[PDB]
Each structure stands twice: as C-alpha cells, then as structure tokens.
Amino acid sequence: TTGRIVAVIGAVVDVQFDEGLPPILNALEVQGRETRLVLEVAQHLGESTVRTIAMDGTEGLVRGQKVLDSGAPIRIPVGPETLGRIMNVIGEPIDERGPIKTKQFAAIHAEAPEFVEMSVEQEILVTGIKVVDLLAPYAKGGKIGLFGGAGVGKTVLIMELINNVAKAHGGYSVFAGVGERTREGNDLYHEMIESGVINLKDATSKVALVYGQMNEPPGARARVALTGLTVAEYFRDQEGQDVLLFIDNIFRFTQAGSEVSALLGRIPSAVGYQPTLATDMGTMQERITTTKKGSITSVQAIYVPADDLTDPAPATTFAHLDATTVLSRAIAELGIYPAVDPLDSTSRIMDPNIVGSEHYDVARGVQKILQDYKSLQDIIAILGMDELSEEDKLTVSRARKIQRFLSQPFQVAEVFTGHLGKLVPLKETIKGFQQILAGEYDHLPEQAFYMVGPIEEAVAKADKLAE
Template sequence: MPQDARPVGRIEAAQGPVIDVRCTYLPPLGQALDVVNGSNRYVLVVHQHLAPTLVRAIALHAVAGLYRGMPVFDRGAPLHVPVDPGCLGRMLNVFGEALDGGAPLADSDFRNVLAAPPALADTLPPIRILETGIKVIDLLCPFVRGGKTGLFGGAGVGKTVLMMEFMHAVSAEMHGVSVFAGVGERMREGHEMWHEMQDAGVLQRSLLVYGQMDESPGVRFYVGYTALTYAEYLRDTLASEVLFLMDNIFRFIQAGSEISGLLGRMPATVGYQPTLPSEVASLQERIVSTRSGSITAVQAVYVPADDMSDPAVATVLGHLDSTVILSRQQAAKGIYPAVDPLRSGSRIMDHHLLGMRHYHAARTVREHLARYLELEDIIAMLGIEELSPEDRRIVGRARRLQRYLTQPFAVVADHTGIAGARVPLAQTIADCEAIIDGRYDQLAETDCYMRGAMPS
C-alpha cells in the first residue's frame, strides 16, 4: 500500500468477520480493501452495497484488533495473487504468501483470484482419456482429459493416497504438474501431506495451497479460487498437463453457506445458500482445456449422511464427467484402491470414444463382478459347491478380476514394502480379456493380488 494512500472510508461496525465500512465513494463488488493496525494488516472483500455510502465486506483475517473508526484503504483491484514459475514445490496460502518458510514469490506479475472462464471459442472439448496407470480407474471409470472427476469417500479408505498417486503419475509419467487445494484442512493433514509428498519425490512438480479449518470463512471460500488461479497460470505458461486436486469441495460449499448467513441472506433448500448453483459453477466452469494445455480436476466430495440427493452433492454431480466411489466394504476386504467398480463410472464410457475393445472389456468385467455380488449370499449360506458349473466359473474369474484390479502404489512403497506399479491401459484390457477367457483359471487367486500386469 503506498505511503500517501488516502482512506476510502472508516469502519462503522464489526460483527465477527462482517465489517461495515462508511465510504466516500462505493468500491465495486469484489474489491479488496486494506485495514492497517500497527504491524497487522487485514484484508476485506466487498460483498454488498447497503447504501450510497455504506458497503459490507468479509474479513479474510482474524478480526481481533479491529475497532470502529479505523481507516480503510482501497487496493484499487480485486483480490489477486502473485504468479511466478517458482511457485512449484511451494506451500502457499489464499494470498499467495509462503507457508513453508521459504522466500516470498516474486511480485512482478499478478492474477485476479475471481476471473471469467476462457471464451468458448478458445476451449477444447473434453473427449480424450487421461491415463493414470491405475488399472481399475482407467478401465471402468476413466478420467477425461480436461474434465472433472469426483472422488467420493470417507475417512480411512485411501482417498489421500489415491490423490498422491494421481499427482505422482502426472509428474513422473506425463511430465505435468499438480496443484492441490486444501479447503478447510486440519493442520495435521497439511503437515502429513507435505512430508509424504517430499518422501515420494513429487513435491517439486506440485503446488500446495491451504486455507485452514480455523481461518475465516472468507479464506476457506476463496482458497479454491486461488489454487485454480495458479492452475490456470501453469496451464497457460508451461503448456503442460495440469492436475487440479481439491480436498474438500464440500467445505468450499460450507464456507459459502457461512458467508451467506453472515450477509443476512435467507437460506434456501435444506439450509444451503440461495447462491449455491452459481458459486459451484463459478469454480467448475474455469476447469477447461485450451490450446495451451488442459486442467484435469479431481475433487474429493463429502456426502452428508450418505445422501447422494443432498443439494450440495447433487449440484457438484451435475458438473462432473467421472465419479469414483470409494467403498469401505472394499477396503475391509483388503481391496486397494478401494474403488467400487459397480457404482463408479464415467460419461466417456462410450464405444465411439473408447473403442469397441475397451468398451466391451469394461462391460464384461462389470457383468462378472455384478454376478459375483448376486451370488455372494448363496455362497455364504450354502457354499460354492451348490452353484452350477457356469456360475462357479464366473465366480472364480470374478474373484481373480477383483484381485487383479488391486494395485501397489509408488507413493506408499516405503510403508508397504511393495514397489509401485503403473500399468498401461492396453495391458490392463489384455489382462482382463485373458482372465475372462479362462486363460488364468489355473492360477491361484493370491497370484493376481497386488501386482502390476499379469505374467505373459
């Protein structure tokens, strides 16, 4: 802020993070304002015009130390962050400031956190697969390059490990970069991910942006936009594959609901904010491919009370190209990654886009696993000997497929003692066809478990 800056107004009221400012002129909605109290600086974002000389703003810092009558200064711009190629390998906050103890980013170039998506004429349709090397995902619920994937899973089913493996695949195999948005994360989770990514060797091709759980709802709301701004910058400047991960988008929606209540808006369905669809869309519609590169998003989604019809979940689902459901039942059986193969899917599962061979293999694998699920109760009560010979063959092959679709991950190799394996999609399809055709009927089921490709 310049030394000779003149205040735009003064604080008239402060109620928690809601600050009313009496102004000499009206700053536009979304404008960033500064309040200085000694060595402390507070950033406010204008959200409402209450009168010709009165605005209501949300504070992005803890408000201890603010009082009525304090001068408020206009930044002259919306909330923006410094962008620089040196951001890779760093941990930043919602303002682009270092959280890792390193040097601040160069402030020669800035980008606004809230920005319009690229023009429709400049975007490319998401119709290609992004191969991750993870067998069950590439086969049954493939990622769409430049698309959006929802990762539905509770605690302890391997969600974070799966995200780290995605980041490893993009950085090591595709020479791309990853941007991770920790929305409302616990400090413990941030520390763990930071150290695990260092140990796995993927940190130098990644950027972490955190808004912690104990921070203002404004921080938790804007941190997703900050991370997406860095993802757009890396896509446009590096012209490479960018993987954008958000954990958890439900906390972004919760922060928006808190802000809506603080501003006095009447709640809508099930108590959510009336602006829920537009807020989610303003984030999702910026995740697109352009001629410079593509942003592929993986978003963890919390499902309140396991109700997939919850308005927040339904709103997010409307934007997704692929859904990956992580099942606690799969994890309890030792099936990792714990992807539910029958409930997960992708809109790109079409023979025109995948080719007949991939489409047929995926459909046949699902048929075998669905038939095995139907017969599980009979097997538990009467034994497998009571099944017909055809059903016994299907069950044996389905169990081998179930174990084949497990996979050791490179990012946890130090913990498991098993070297990570990446399997190309063509090899996965060939192996599944061989199992379905009965070429591995004599192979023990344990020999299919936690391995890469099948022996030729």
C-alpha cells in the first residue's frame, strides 16, 4: 500500500496508508528516502492510519510523504555471511565492509518456539570462574542475567567472559551491542579484530555483531534485539549451534520501549516503565530459548537501574532468569573485581545432584558463612575491627580469606591492573575453599589470598609478602 506521512510528531510517524494498509508490524519504506526509513507499524489507528514508529531519523521530511510498505515486517539479511560482520538492525554493513551476502532474509519477529522444543536438560556450563560457577552454576544454553549496575569493569568482565568462553567453544556468538556507546563498540571492535576472534581475512569469526547504539531510534534500538534474536535462532537450530548471545543491554531495550511507550500511547506504568513491560519481556524472553536443536546460551547484560532490582523492571527480569549475576556495586566499592554480589548471583539450578552435593554444600556453607559474617558486621562497625570475640574472628577472617580468594585477577584489565587474570576449573576451586574451610591457612593470613586464581598462588603470594 502507499502511505502519506500524515503526522510526524517527533519520530512517531503516523502514516495514513492510503491504498489500504499493510498489517501490523509491517516494515514500511518511506518513499523519498536516502536511507530508507523503515517504519514499524504499531497500531492501525484506524482510518487506514497507523501509528508507526520511525526506525530512522525523521528530518527533512515533507509531510504527506509517500511511503511504500515493504509488505512485511522488517526483514533482514540472514545467512552465514553474518559471521564476522557488524550488522545493524537492518542488517546493514555497519562493519562498513560492504554488504552482507547473506542468503536468507527473515522477518525479525521471531516468536516463541514451542514448549516441546525446549531441551529440558542442560548441563552446567562451567565458566571456570570460581565464584561464578560456584554460586550460580551456569548451564549451557542458560539465560544468564548479568545484573550489575554501571561501569564496574562490567562490560570488561563480560568481554572477558567472551574471551574465556566463546573462544573456548565451537559455540558461536552473537554480540548485540545495543544502545552501547558507539565508542565502546569501537573499542570492543578493536579487541576482536585484535583477538583475531574477529578474524576478517576469513570474514567469519563465529560471531555476529549487531549493534544498535545509543543514538538510534529507540524503537529501532528496541528492535535490534529482535533482529539478533531472529538471526540467532537461525544459527541456533538451523546452524544447530550453541550460540552465545550477548545482549548489552536488555535494560536499555526495555527502556527504549518505555521511552516510546508514552508515545505509543501506552501509559508507561510504574517507574515510567511501559505498561506492556510484561509483554515486552515475556515475548522476548519467550522468544529466547535453548531448544533441542541448539542453544542460545543467553547472556544478557542487565544494567541494574540505580541498583534497584526492586525496580519493577529488573524485578520482572528476574522471572525470566534462571541464573542471575547480580554484581554488587558495594563490593565493587569494596574494590573488588570480582566485584559481584555473591549472595545474590544464583542459579536456581544449583544441585546436590547436578552440581553434586559437594559443590552444592560448599556453596551453601559458604553462602551461609558469608551470610553469617554479615551478621557479625553488625557488631563490628561500631564495636571493633581487629577486636571482639574470636571464634567469630576465626570465621571473620575465614570469610575474609574467602573473599580474597574469591577475588581473582582481571585478564585484560591487566592492562590496567597489571594483574594477570586467572581462572580455576571447578574442582580445584571447590577443594580450594574446602581447604580454607578446613581452616588450613590460618597460620596463613589474608592478603595473600587476594586476587588469585588457584590457592597455591596465594600460598606463593604469602611468601612474597613475608618480606
């Protein structure tokens, strides 16, 4: 059909479609566009007028301007050709490496695969990051939230995870730098190039980069998430791969939604969040899956607004999550990196069976002690800090060691730290703590334990410290 811009009210372009309409969600192309203006249909407002969503900037546009419906929703390049490619929402070679010679298009409305398709079992994905596995044992294919509020090497960590993992598997990647600083995507870019994990000589990597930075129409930015999903589903099942899906930042997605929600006429409910908050997520998360024919191990960076998770949005988010990483900015403020919240960073799927009881218990004991330790905090702030009762001291110290031991060097922010990152596969870890648990190193003292990979290195560090 043809539309006329009948109203441009901001980048909300209400199009009165003239020759009828196209159905909902149809991607529309504005006639008279140097950079095709994909409009996403939102309401058929009636009167063959739709409220549409600009997916480009709306500048210069003549009101009335002619729109030709793409006859579908947003359909996007798909094909293996996306590996080692930076695509935008509309797939576009924002790699700036010429058009992607994709062999398939897809409407980016991918939907929820069926109940039956879902692999009912997963296996703990071990990250080899002690803490991680330990408290939130991740499952291959899992939906991981990285809650964490801002800045805390968060992204760094994430990247590092990518290093650790994506390299390490035949698992493919999608990285969606959504809403991210173009700059950080740049930075990031260079890292992959550098890493050679974006290897471009063979364009392929194993990785789709999808970027929808914080300078793009929110709806569009909102939709870049779908885009990636659609692609990945293709890789997931069709390419059969365990794709690792990095989303940074699903909060911003939600946000993007909310910003528009108003404009979408939806009354964006509490905390400003879109009233459709539930559906937005619901559909999305439900679009996400690890099925039987593949995994999308979904790593969702989740900015925690104001570190408020009780913020309805994260609160919702939580529902979808099955492994949560809540990074604690306080702990971060305690300087750490592991900066995480640990007594919040879970997977409901920790098991005395599946992680075995050893792990499980160790974690539980540990978690407990930390929790206990926390209790002791209550004495100490005002009542003593190398001072009160002592058995509790014993634990205090132990907790403290545990803390330090929980700290592990950053493996690329060695650039900053000079600490070579470390990693400890699971048993040595479990054991590790057991030794500490065993209270072995009590002759030994704290700081030796800090920022290590396996415990020996701490032992070693002790020695260096005895000078």
